[PDB]
């Protein structure tokens, strides 16, 4: 009926990422199996328009059905584990196996990489994703 679940992704040594525009890092897969999901981030954006941003997407990796509908929310955890800078889908999106949905302009690199803003404690970026399938 309703299935809600989450995944915390810690990306270590974030400041050292050498990904150029268009290059991707994928997380490990996770589930609530049947369905398998992963997160995917472009540290230097998906394209020229988003070069100044991290792009963050949810990918349906494996799926027994033709399609699944899911709402999602991504946030960044601070040193206290508190969610900050969240973006949420305003409705459910249609995933098929191999389809992603997310935010091309999730967070400004010039904000995230300034350590005084407190989102890279010990140079780790911690993302938190919550997914609901109805």
């Amino acid at each position: 009926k309703v299935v809600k679940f989450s995944y915390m992704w810690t990306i270590n040594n974030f400041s050292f990422c050498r990904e150029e525009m268009g290059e991707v890092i994928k997380s490990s897969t996770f589930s609530s199996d049947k369905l398998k999901w992963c997160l995917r981030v472009n540290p230097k954006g998906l394209d020229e328009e988003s070069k100044d941003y991290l792009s963050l997407y949810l990918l349906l990796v494996s799926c027994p059905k033709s399609e699944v509908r899911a709402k999602f929310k991504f946030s960044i955890l601070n040193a206290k584990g508190e969610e900050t800078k969240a973006m949420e889908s305003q409705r459910a999106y249609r995933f098929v196996q191999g389809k992603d949905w997310g935010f091309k302009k999730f967070i400004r690199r010039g904000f995230l990489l300034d350590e005084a803003n407190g989102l890279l404690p010990d140079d780790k970026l911690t993302l938190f994703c919550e997914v609901s399938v109805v």
Binding site: M87, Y93, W101, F103, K105
Partner: peptide, 8 residues
């Protein structure tokens, strides 16, 4: 910045 899109 808050628009949902897909890479495909």
């Amino acid at each position: 910045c808050d628009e949902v899109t897909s890479t495909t």
